[PDB]
């Protein structure tokens, strides 16, 4: 109930939002239907448009208007955008040549800059360069400002999930938004675009920018928009609050539009039909530049224009339906469109089983245009699984696409020409980043970065201490003339062990064998030296990683490679080695072929055994440092040793052989040298992070070696290719994977071809940022380098995403 009697006089868009049963006045009151009775009446007016004309310049003030144009309107601040161009001579902003912002210019009152958030929903990262004949104010904010050529929105590229992230710097799975529709089974409770359910706090996770602002004392105008207020009412709305008396006025801001989305959906996002939306948005901007500058505040103020995600070409009869695959269609509940999501219709179903629904989904058909996977074995770059609200089977639909459960549902549940949600690597899906004010630079164009990593710095830009989230604090300070947030590189938790030759061969039962006592006092000192650690420096080019929890390693060094061996996991943490552009490919050795090797430096309680690899009829092993690139035939032995074996399903080791063999070379020669750093990640619970021991699901059957849920490798080389991996003065350049550790390819299915078919495709599809594998490992790479360390925290968030050009 609402006791709608109640009235909005003196307080239209008041910022403090009041409880049932009295009646509302805020921005949205319209959404709750809670309105006071002369709401649209004191707060909603039109009355004459949004604009001046010369004949109502210096009218008597008639309260009744939408905007004002009397004498009285700027002490007031209500004037229209437009008053001091039509009535005072002005120029609107858009008409003045761009001037550095070198210090912020506030009127006497303000603190700080304030921010102002500008979003706007579905409006895909190319129409900056597409549609900037039709948008001057956009286009000036971009090129006087800084930008981004586009910023990568997180998956699902929905509405809801990509505006919290904004909001809170969190991935969907944390902030808990991680569709526009979702079932909680914990409350059994749906969360729809439509209806009531969705403005319960529970479903909101995590801590948006205007609740840390209001916590630390930063007053926050309200981010969100009922959709029947006009634009031009929620600037003047924006431009009112800017007037407030000091210690009542916000210092952070937002306006939100629905299009160019609304549009793009109905046209496609290049139907002709787009360029109007496009051209009402810059007018809009325009707006909120003209009134800022009414009101001194367009040299003082910090702008971000940005968008939640893009827009593809989807039509209805781009379609699969499951009807197609499936026996058991009616089992099962859907959530459609450009992702898919399958849970069982009937938790009281004993029939249901996931792994007879995924087989059946599995390339059915030659052209099939989406993919199955248990969540676990999404790309872990999409960060989309720890999350009750996530089923666990899941379909990426390819782009263009979308998935529903049957045909009825596409013409009794063509329409439209455009959606999204898709991967989040997908060009389509890109959208845009343009920060102008004082606290950003002049003219800067920065590399494509990813929106979790805006809130801390809008937490820099209000002086905020961000809330935990997924930015890596730091790695956009390049976009900031001042106020950037210079952190230092955390402390090792851990120290390796270096040990010596303290074995004997005999001393080991491993069930291993090697034709290895085939093989000089010139010589045997020059082996002793490699043991020692006198070729690391061409094999570790950025120091060792530091390991950032309590564990027990060794640091191994040999002629070709360096590891870190953990005696918890038995096999190395890390192994990392360099290949120059001459490198040469060699084979596996018919003698050596089944070669393991003790290491007389590791004891044999902290070493795998062969054994348990001949016993376990599922599991094979690989090496961390291949064999096939060893520098001569006797550095080769040392890839044999049980210290860089790895336990690896038969149908992996395919992948990573090939790999191995073909594809590091092929990035040598590609990128003037390579540096590799490998290595297992164990992530049973999927929660994006480095599990402790008693996680573990699985190991070498009979034994305590644990298997990995997952492969590393980061690929570093100098950006300048000019200059050779291992002598590189400036700028790295870097590509990264994080393959899923299957005992099958179903996932490739083309996989009954030659590797050179399918493998890369599959790794592509697991590109992964640094950073992600820190999350993974508790390592930390790139300790010991030439380059400032926001430089390197940039590198670190760093992902190769293998599209064409934007
Ligand atoms: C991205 O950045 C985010 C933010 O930094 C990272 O997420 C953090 O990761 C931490 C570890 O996973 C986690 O820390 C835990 O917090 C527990 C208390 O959590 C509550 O309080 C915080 C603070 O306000 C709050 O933010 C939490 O919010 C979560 O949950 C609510 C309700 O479900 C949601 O609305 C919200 O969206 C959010 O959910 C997300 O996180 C939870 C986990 O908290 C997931 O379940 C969801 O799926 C979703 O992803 C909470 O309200 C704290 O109690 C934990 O401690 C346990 O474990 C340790 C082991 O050392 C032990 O000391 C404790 O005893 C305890 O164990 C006990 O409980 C176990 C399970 O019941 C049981 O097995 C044991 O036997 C014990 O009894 C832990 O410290 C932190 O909460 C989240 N924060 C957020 C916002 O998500 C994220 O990791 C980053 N991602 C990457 C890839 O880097
Ligand atoms: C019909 N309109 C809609 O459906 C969307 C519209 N959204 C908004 O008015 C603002 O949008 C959001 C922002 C806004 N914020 C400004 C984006 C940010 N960008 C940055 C850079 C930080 S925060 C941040 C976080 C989540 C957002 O929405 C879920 C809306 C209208 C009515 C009710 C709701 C809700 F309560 F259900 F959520 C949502
Ligand atoms: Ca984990
Ligand atoms: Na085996
Ligand atoms: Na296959
Ligand atoms: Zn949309």
């Not at 549902?409 to 899906?429: A, E, I, P």
């Not at 060893?630 to 040392?638: G, L, M, T």
Request: proline letters at 7%; one cysteine or more.
């Amino acid at each position: 109930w609402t006791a709608t009697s109640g009235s909005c006089k003196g307080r239209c868009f008041e910022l403090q939002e009041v409880g049932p049963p009295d009646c509302r006045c805020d921005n949205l009151c319209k959404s709750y239907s809670s309105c006071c009775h002369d709401f649209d009446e004191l707060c909603l007016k039109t009355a004459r448009g949004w604009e001046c004309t010369k004949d109502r310049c210096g009218e008597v003030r008639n309260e009744e208007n939408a905007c004002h144009c009397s004498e009285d309107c700027l002490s007031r601040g209500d004037c229209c955008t437009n008053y001091q161009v039509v009535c005072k001579g002005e120029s609107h902003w858009v008409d003045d040549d761009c001037e550095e912002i070198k210090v912020p210019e506030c009127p006497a009152g303000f603190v700080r800059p304030p921010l102002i958030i500008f979003s706007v929903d579905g409006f895909r990262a190319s129409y900056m360069k597409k549609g900037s004949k039709v948008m001057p104010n956009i286009e000036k904010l971009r090129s006087c400002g800084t930008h981004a050529p586009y910023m990568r929105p997180v998956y699902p590229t929905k509405t809801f999930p990509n505006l919290y992230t904004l909001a809170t710097g969190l991935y969907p799975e944390s902030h808990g938004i991680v569709g526009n529709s979702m079932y909680d089974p914990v409350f059994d409770a749906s969360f729809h675009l439509r209806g009531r359910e969705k403005f319960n706090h529970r479903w909101w996770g995590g801590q948006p920018l205007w609740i840390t602002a209001t916590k630390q004392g930063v007053r926050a105008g309200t981010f969100f928009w009922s959709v029947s207020i006009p634009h031009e009412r929620r600037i003047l709305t924006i431009l009112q609050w800017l007037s407030l008396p000091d210690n009542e006025r916000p210092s952070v801001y937002a306006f939100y539009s629905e299009q160019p989305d609304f549009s793009g959906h109905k046209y496609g996002p290049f139907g002709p039909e787009m360029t109007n939306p496009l051209r009402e948005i810059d007018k809009t901007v325009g707006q909120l530049m003209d009134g800022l500058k009414q009101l001194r505040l367009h040299r003082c103020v910090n702008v971000i224009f940005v968008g939640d995600h893009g827009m593809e070409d989807v039509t209805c009869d781009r379609t699969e339906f499951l009807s197609n695959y499936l026996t058991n269609v009616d089992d099962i509940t859907l959530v459609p469109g450009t992702l898919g999501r399958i849970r069982a219709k009937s938790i009281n179903n004993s029939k249901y089983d996931p792994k007879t629904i995924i087989a059946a989904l599995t390339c059915k058909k030659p052209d099939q245009h989406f993919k199955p996977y248990m969540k676990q074995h999404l790309p872990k770059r999409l960060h989309y699984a720890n999350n009750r609200r996530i089923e666990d089977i899941h379909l990426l639909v390819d782009r263009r696409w979308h998935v529903a459960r049957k045909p009825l549902d596409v013409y009794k549940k063509c329409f439209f020409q455009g959606d999204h949600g898709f991967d989040n690597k997908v060009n389509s899906m890109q959208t845009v980043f343009v920060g102008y004010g004082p606290t950003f630079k002049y003219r800067t164009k920065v590399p494509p970065f990813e929106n979790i990593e805006l809130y801390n710095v809008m937490c820099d830009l209000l002086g905020l201490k961000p809330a935990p989230n997924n930015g890596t604090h730091g790695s956009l300070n390049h976009l900031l003339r001042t106020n950037t947030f210079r952190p230092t590189m955390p402390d090792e938790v851990s120290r390796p062990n270096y040990p010596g030759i303290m074995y004997l061969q005999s001393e080991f039962d491993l069930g291993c064998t090697c034709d290895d006592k085939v093989e000089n006092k010139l010589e045997e000192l020059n082996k002793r030296l490699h043991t020692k650690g006198s070729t690391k420096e061409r094999h570790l080019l950025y120091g060792r990683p530091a390991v950032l929890y309590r564990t027990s390693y060794d640091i191994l060094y040999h002629t070709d490679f360096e590891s870190g061996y953990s005696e918890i996991f038995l096999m190395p943490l890390w192994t990392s080695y360099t290949i120059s552009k001459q490198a040469e490919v060699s084979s596996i050795p018919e003698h050596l072929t089944n070669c393991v090797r003790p290491d007389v430096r590791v004891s044999p309680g902290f070493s795998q055994n062969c054994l348990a690899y001949k016993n376990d009829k599922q599991m094979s092993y690989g090496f961390l440092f291949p064999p096939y690139l060893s520098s001569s035939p006797e550095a080769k032995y040392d890839a044999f040793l049980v210290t860089n074996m790895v336990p690896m399903y038969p149908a992996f080791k395919r992948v990573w052989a090939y790999f191995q063999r073909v594809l590091v070379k092929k990035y040598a020669s590609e990128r003037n040298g390579v540096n590799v750093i490998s290595g297992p990640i164990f992530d049973y619970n999927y929660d994006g992070l480095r599990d402790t021991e008693d996680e573990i699901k699985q190991y070498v059957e009979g034994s305590s070696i644990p298997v990995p849920t997952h492969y590393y490798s980061i690929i570093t080389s100098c950006l300048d290719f000019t200059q050779p991996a291992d002598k590189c003065d400036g700028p790295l350049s870097v590509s990264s994977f994080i393959l899923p550790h299957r005992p099958d390819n179903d996932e490739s299915c083309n996989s009954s071809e030659d590797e050179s078919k399918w493998v890369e495709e599959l790794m592509k599809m697991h590109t992964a940022r640094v950073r992600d594998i820190e999350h993974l490992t508790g390592l930390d790479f790139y300790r010991k380098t030439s380059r400032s360390y926001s430089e390197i925290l940039t590198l670190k968030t760093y992902l190769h995403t293998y599209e064409s050009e934007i």
